[PDB]
Amino acid sequence: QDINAQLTTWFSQRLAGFSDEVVVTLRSSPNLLPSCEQPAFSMKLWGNVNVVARCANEKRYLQVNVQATGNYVAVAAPIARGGKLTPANVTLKRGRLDQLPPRTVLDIRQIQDAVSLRDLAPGQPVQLTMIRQAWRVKAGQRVQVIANGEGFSVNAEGQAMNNAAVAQNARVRMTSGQIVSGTVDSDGNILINLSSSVDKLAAALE
Ligand SMILES: [Cl-]
């Protein structure tokens, strides 16, 4: 029961913070098990995984099944496409992590300012493919364009032409109809960082 106890302890410690119940089952032939007392294990965190087990003169490829139970983010109330994920409509549920659909959110902090891309039903695990970050800037919104660099500062008002989250690109129509583009910041401003532009900016003032 040596290898089974060692693998159980190894995956339990590796899964600290993800799971409080880790069960390991060997799927490969016991004839290909490491011979040494303390094999070095190395490596997907759970489910059907391959583990390399090294001993002096051995490099075993073990196939194991890892059952890991812990918390994951699930839908707690109906959420419409475009609906904000809140503490009223998404919660932590306890379940078999190894049976979850791909890219299920495990940490409730990952869903802060998230918005649903789909109509979601209660009990559904929240997957990264079902959600997006909220729009800090929305199409048609009055925004501030801030350009800085080479002893120059420009502050101008415009209308956001597209929806954009923080750190995403936003095109902005200036009052004349000229379109500029920059990065959305936490304040909903559009940031531009400035070779001929600093020369062009000064030339515009002439
Ligand atoms: Cl949004």
Numbering used by the authors: 1 to 43, 48 to 198, 202 to 213
Sentences from the paper on this structure:
FlgA is a periplasmic flagellar protein that chaperones P-ring formation. FlgA possesses a typical signal sequence at its N-terminus, recognized by the Sec-dependent pathway, suggesting that FlgA functions as a P-ring assembly chaperone in the periplasm. P-ring formation is a key step enabling the bacterial flagellum to pass through the outer membrane. FlgA can be divided into three domains, denominated as D1 (residues 1–74), D2 (residues 75–142), and D3 (residues 143–198).
To gain insight into the regulatory mechanism of P-ring assembly by FlgA, two different atomic structures of FlgA from S. enterica, the open and closed forms were solved. Atomic models were built from amino acid residues Q1 through L198 (numbering corresponds to the mature protein) for the open and closed forms and refined at resolutions of 1.95 Å and 2.3 Å, respectively. For the open form, a segment from T44 thorough A47 was not traced in the final model due to the poor quality of the electron density map in this region. The conformation of FlgA is different in the two forms. While the structures of corresponding domains are similar in the open and closed forms, the D1 domains of the two forms align with an RMSD of 0.64 Å, while the D2 and D3 domains align with RMSDs of 0.35 Å and 0.33 Å, respectively. Based upon the structural difference induced by crystal packing, we tested whether the closed and open forms were possible in solution. FlgAR113C-S190C is locked in one conformation, while FlgA adopts intermediate structures upon immobilization, suggesting that FlgA might exist in the periplasm as a flexible intermediate structure, or in equilibrium between the open and closed forms defined here. Perhaps FlgA switches conformations from the closed to the open form after interacting with cellular components or other flagellar proteins.
